[PDB]
Design a protein around this nucleic acid. Structure first.
Lengths: 165, 146, 359
RNA sequence: CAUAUCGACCGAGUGGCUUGCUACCUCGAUGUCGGUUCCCUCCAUCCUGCCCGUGCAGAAGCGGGCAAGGGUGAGGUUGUUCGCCUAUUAAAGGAGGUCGUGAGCUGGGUUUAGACCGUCGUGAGACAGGUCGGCUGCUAUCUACUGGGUGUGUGGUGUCUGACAAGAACGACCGUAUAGUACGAGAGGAACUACGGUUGGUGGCCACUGGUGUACCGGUUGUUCGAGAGAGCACGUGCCGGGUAGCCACGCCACACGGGGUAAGAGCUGAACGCAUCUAAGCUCGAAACCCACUUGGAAAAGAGACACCGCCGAGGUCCC
RNA sequence: CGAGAACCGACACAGGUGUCCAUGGCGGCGAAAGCCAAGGCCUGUCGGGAGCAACCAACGUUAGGGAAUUCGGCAAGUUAG
RNA sequence: CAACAGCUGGUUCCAAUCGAAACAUGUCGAAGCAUGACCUCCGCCGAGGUAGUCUGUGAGGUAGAGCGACCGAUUGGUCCUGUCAAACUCCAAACUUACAGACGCCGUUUGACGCGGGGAUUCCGGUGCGCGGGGUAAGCCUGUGUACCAGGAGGGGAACAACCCAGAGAUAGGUUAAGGUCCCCAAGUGUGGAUUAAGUGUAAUCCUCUGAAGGUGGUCUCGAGCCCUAGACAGCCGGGAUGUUGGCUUAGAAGCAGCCAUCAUUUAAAGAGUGCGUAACAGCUCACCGGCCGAGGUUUGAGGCGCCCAAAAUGAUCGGGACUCAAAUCCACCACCGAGACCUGUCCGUACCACUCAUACUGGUAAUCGAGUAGAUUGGCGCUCUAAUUGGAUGGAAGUAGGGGUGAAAACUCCUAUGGACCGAUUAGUGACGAAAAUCCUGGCCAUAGUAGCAGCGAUAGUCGGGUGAGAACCCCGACGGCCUAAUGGAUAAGGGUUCCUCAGCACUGCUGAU
RNA sequence: ACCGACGCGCGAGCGUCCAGUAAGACUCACGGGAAGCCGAUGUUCUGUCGUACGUUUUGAAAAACGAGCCAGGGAGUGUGU
């Protein structure tokens, strides 16, 4: 924190586990919520979660913003309705100033060449319109799930659109 | 007193629109005065008018010390100053037609004869659907001491 | 900071004239006028008094000492010449005068008895050229038709008997505030030919501003000008020097900040001096008192200060400022600002301290 | 009981007090740290004024709004900044001005040359270890400001006017009456208002107390003038005792209220929207803040002022004493 | 001449530079201070004016408090034969 | 000894043509060189050449995409289902690129393309844009393609290397570009329409112009849902039945924590109750019922202009004044202003053509010539003395000062004053042969200034008369007042060297004056 | 150019004909007139543009370096290859 020089893509690939080790584990609980198995897809009421932005939310971003989300999805009696889906994973690894590579801004260090930033965190990135994490059930209430994501958004760097079913 | 050429009223009248005329005309050569500085109005108000102006709350006055600059407090100076803007006051026919213009304090104009309005720079403050609170002249310079 | 000293009196020059010139005058209704709204003579040093407390809500209604203080010797003073002023725009300007054919026999210096032949130095107010009326007419006509402004009178305090003073009289015009105008104009005309005293405009208990040039030395350093901090020890040995004054674009500093210059001298009024007493020197007593033509009530034995004994008309102005000092000339006024209400025609003045200054 | 209060995650900003970056500026040199002294400012308000909310009985608080008028210190350790500690206090806020301030001071620390100790090194010698000692240049040309004059522009004496300018000229606290009252089971325990006083600041003054007082008077040691008397010297009084004037503070005097307009807020009448509504027009109140009031300056305010009188062959003024 | 102008120091330079007079008087322990002889001098060579301000250099005295000052009692004071 | 330096500084006349490199390889090399790239000059050669485009024949694996195509990541379930890749690829651009033909352009008197040779400069770069890699980021580091600055004027942008217009001979008239037309300031207070009330804004780009995930039934415009003449909203106004507090549960649970039930009655109608509320009741509300006129109502999303989330240090700001049916913003539109650009007259230079011995004339062509740092090339030097040829000067030489003319320029020349005897030109020689700047050398001179110092030292020293004199504060006499006491007294060493004495003096010296 | 004529365009409006339908910089002639009357130097006002010069530098008005001013002096030469 804060996430600033973290989620703007001004770099290019990898993740690559070959290349990198010492990746921190994600603190993003399972990306399968609600009752799985049965096809939730048969449902009235629909979806949400549209990013409306560019990218790279960190696992710190998604994992408390998503279960936060689920927490107020609990209202629908624990195990009784909806499945929650998350889309993208936090693959993508980021490195931060370890003074040896270059100079100035991050992904630059001291000297020239040298320490790339040391591994510290991972974040998935997204596009202008992608569905961050969706799923629904019949209109349980007015739309508790719609209330969900109200809270879900408001912990994402992006401005997420609710998007109607 | 000063010899008038065309004296101009300035009652409900937008100040700049007037002094953006007589400071054109002044330039050409014309001599004279606007009266009713005192009721001469600029729109938008009762706030960022009191301030960024010359009230003793505007802090325009009492702004500084030996560096200035100072502004004006009287309705005469207040839009005399406006007149200097829109004139190359510093030199040449600048401070020339400059000096050759005066604004007079006044209720109905102090000089005998009503002076002309300008090309429509009028308040039209009646059932102001387009109008809103705009009040200035004396009032700004009344909150500020005269 | 707070800033040292206080702007207010400025710039802080020397003082032109060693006579105060009141900037403002009381404004009045139900008034004579006085002409001599201001009237004054000047300082002798002073002791203290025991006074009954006046009329407070407070319990103290008994003896209490206040600095009966700097008794100044006044008066009488004469107003020769009421001067009209009339017409703007510009400012006030004199009209014509009046006159007086009395001429205190000493008002030559700084006045009359100038050499008949012109002198390089300008001549002061002297007159043998007289037109009492004409002046009166000029004023009256320039009343109805034109205008007039507040009228005042010349005044001159005589040194009838003061320690070390002379025919020289240094007097300045004091304004008369009557009612309308024309009523008052009449008043200043009556009190023209004639003379006055403190017991005219005045009253014990009544509050008055007092004005005079402070006594004091010439240029001094920053510390005892507006106060400034001395030190620190380095240039401690040297005179107190304030840190650099202003630094930036103007090389010079207007400053308004701590500069060496003249001090002493002044010209400043004080406000709301109470005037506990009025007085005299002639003997008057409710009961038997010393005889053999005793002297003034309040003058210390041993005289007071350099210029001693008082034996004539006095005034006591408590908590003496006085806004100047020894044998100078303060000017009285009326209390323009006022705060507390007036007290009484007289104060009890149970005791006055008379003792040689030294000892 | 989200929203009296506390308040994560995430998201958006503002400031330019810290730190870092720039290696962009200076190596024919922009004097260091800390302190000091002296001026100005910032908020985003610690106290004081006026307000709103409360998990507001009261009292004491907690949180929020307007608001910068005034106020917001003394000491012990340490070179310290910082910080720790003590007793006071209404409170003893933080930050910027070349980490404000060396043509102002200081020189205790860093970081010259001397030396010791520890550690390292074969050694010279070293240390982002410790320690003792260790220098502070310049006559101000310009500009800036504080004060003072001479001129120019728009006869003299005296008295004024007031465009503008400065102020914190006042800030705060304790106590008594109210009242052992209201409120409260009780314990406890207010207020409006009226008074007395203290503290901090400001201006002035010396009768009083106090300081000085190499004016003066006395006592007395040494020595020289033979003694006596009367004197010199002993830094510019030998020393001691007393002390006038003056100058001073540790001494004394004086330093409002009130009115007008507002902020937050409390309301009135009142529509849009037949009702409701403090607001949209209108209006009544309402802050230590704003204006006035009060003190000070101020005819060079170029619209360069007013008035009265005297005067142009003498009014006045300079020199002189 | 032998030196606050005859020597060395660029100078009529507050610096530096050896010897003998150490028995002039009072003083006192004294070749000490202070004062005074003999002898030398007014050439440690620019003057005149203002109670002569601010500020600076040397210095005297300061009530009550008494190291609170400061890195540190630096400076001054105290004591004194 | 004029040491050497790869390091700093300096290197003096005019003009014309061309016109860089801040890169590559090697280097005890990175503050330097060499060799290439690149610039220029000369000679040669001889007919083609290729900066643009099109088509043809080839090369390619970046963007994107995808992985029931490899590969390696990466969910869940009982085949469905959820995700990815700089060092993955079943696919796959734009685009870059070899060669050829075509058109274009160019070249054969301006000889291209190319070959050989002489001379370099240069190897600290920078910025914008596009693509990048590193880094939190940077007015960061480091690549790449390109255009620009460097070395590029002029117009605009408030100012401003690289942002916009624009690439510049002189002079002149004209029309535009960017940008701008309320004033300052040339040209509109332009037209049709709409938004905005915040002084929002009047800010293309950017270190620079902030603003991200405070408020407004002020007003205008646009959209969506639901309700309405079976009469809505107000929609507005008024009212909010009996068993019964339904059974259970619970401390309570009374329509409204929860579970079960949801009947019946009296009704015009009224649920075993829609939400608020109470501890539970109460109370409010709907839901529900009655009335009332007549036409839209209500809910909500968005935008325009205005109005009253968002904290910084000397005095606020769009360049300023100031502006609101705008001088703001958006959609359209009309007329103007405004560069050295573009057009146009004359002239100049350069190149080329014709004529010519000629680079002298004359005529001709340039839409396809005219900016320039380093540098290459070319037309227009100065000094001494010697010699040959040949001139000037007392009717005034050289030199100097000030001024006129020529030359790109080094430099040449004239006029006036001064000066008061020497001075050139051409050709051939000769050699102690060379400005604005170098903390440059030498001399002279202004400001500084009638300023600082001529006070500070334990030695604070004079004053009144008089003498002499052209002149007297300080030369001498007297008086009075002081200073020095191991020395400011006496005698001497060294060292000085005539400073000693007398007379005459005052231009020099004496911290003022001086007899 | 209008107008009018003809022909087009959804329309604003356009095409064709009428139609390339006085004035116009320079220069000259006649007549009349001017002699400070027509045609550089000093200083100053107005308009446009404009923060020296040289050097260092990617970038200089520069808070990067140099010079107080002026005169005179002051830097590519010789031999050998």
């Amino acid at each position: 924190r804060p996430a600033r020089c973290y989620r703007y893509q001004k770099n290019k690939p990898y993740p690559k586990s070959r290349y990198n080790r010492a990746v921190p584990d994600s603190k993003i609980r399972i990306y399968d919520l609600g009752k799985k198995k049965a096809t939730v897809d048969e449902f009235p009421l629909c979806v949400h979660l549209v990013s409306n932005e560019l990218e790279q939310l960190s696992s710190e971003a998604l994992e408390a913003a998503r279960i936060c989300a689920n927490k107020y999805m609990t209202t629908v009696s624990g195990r009784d309705a909806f499945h929650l889906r998350v889309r993208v994973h936090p693959f993508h690894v980021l490195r931060i100033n370890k003074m040896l590579s270059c100079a100035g801004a991050d992904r630059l260090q001291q000297g020239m060449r040298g320490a790339w930033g040391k591994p510290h965190g991972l974040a998935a990135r997204v596009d202008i319109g992608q569905i961050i994490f969706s799923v629904r059930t019949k209109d349980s209430n007015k739309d508790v799930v719609v209330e969900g994501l109200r809270r879900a958004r408001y912990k994402f760097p992006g401005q997420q659109k609710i998007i109607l079913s | 007193s000063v010899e008038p050429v065309v004296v101009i009223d300035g009652k409900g009248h937008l100040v700049g629109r007037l002094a953006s005329v007589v400071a054109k005309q002044l330039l050409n050569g014309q001599k004279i005065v606007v009266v009713r500085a005192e009721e001469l109005n600029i729109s938008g108000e009762f706030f960022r008018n009191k301030l960024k102006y010359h009230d003793f709350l505007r802090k325009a006055t009492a702004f500084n010390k030996t560096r200035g600059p100072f502004h004006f407090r009287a309705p005469s100076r207040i839009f005399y100053k406006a007149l200097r803007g829109m004139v190359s006051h510093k030199t040449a026919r600048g401070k020339a037609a400059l000096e050759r213009l005066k604004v007079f304090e006044g209720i109905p104009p102090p000089y005998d004869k009503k002076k002309r309005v300008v090309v429509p720079q009028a308040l039209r403050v009646l059932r102001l659907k387009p109008g809103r609170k705009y009040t200035t002249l004396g009032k700004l310079s009344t909150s500020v001491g005269w | 900071a707070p800033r040292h000293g206080h702007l207010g009196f400025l710039p802080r020059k020397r003082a032109a004239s060693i006579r105060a010139r009141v900037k403002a005058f009381p404004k009045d209704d139900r008034s004579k006028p006085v002409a001599l709204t201001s009237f004054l003579g000047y300082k002798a040093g002073m002791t203290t008094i025991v006074r009954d407390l006046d009329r407070p809500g407070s319990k103290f209604h008994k003896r209490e000492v206040v600095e009966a203080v700097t008794v100044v010797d006044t008066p009488p003073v004469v107003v020769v010449g009421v001067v009209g002023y009339v017409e703007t725009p510009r400012g006030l300007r004199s009209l014509t005068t009046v006159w007086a054919e009395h001429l205190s026999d000493e008002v030559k210096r700084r006045f009359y008895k100038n050499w008949y032949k012109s002198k390089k130095k300008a001549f002061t107010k002297y007159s043998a050229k007289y037109a009492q009326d004409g002046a009166g007419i000029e004023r009256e006509l320039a009343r109805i038709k034109k205008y007039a402004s507040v009228v005042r009178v010349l005044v001159h305090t005589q040194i009838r008997k003061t320690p070390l003073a002379q025919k020289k009289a240094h007097l300045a015009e004091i304004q008369l505030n009557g009612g309308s105008i024309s009523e008052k104009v009449d008043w200043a005309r009556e009190h023209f030919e004639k003379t006055v005293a403190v017991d005219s405009v005045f009253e014990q208990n009544e509050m008055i501003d007092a004005i005079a040039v402070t006594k004091g030395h010439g240029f001094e350093g920053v510390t005892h000008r507006w106060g400034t901090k001395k030190l620190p020890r380095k240039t401690h040995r040297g005179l107190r020097k304030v840190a650099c004054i202003g630094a930036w674009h103007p090389a010079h500093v207007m400053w308004s900040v701590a500069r060496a210059g003249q001090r002493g001298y002044h010209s400043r009024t004080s406000i709301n001096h109470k005037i506990y007493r009025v007085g005299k020197g002639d003997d008057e007593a409710n009961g038997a008192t010393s005889f053999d033509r005793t002297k003034k009530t309040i003058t210390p034995m041993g005289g007071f200060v350099h210029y001693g004994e008082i034996k004539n008309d006095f005034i006591m102005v408590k908590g003496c400022i006085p806004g100047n000092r020894k044998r100078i000339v303060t000017l009285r006024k009326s209390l323009y600002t006022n705060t507390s209400r007036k007290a009484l025609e007289e104060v009890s003045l149970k005791w006055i301290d008379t003792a040689s200054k030294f000892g």
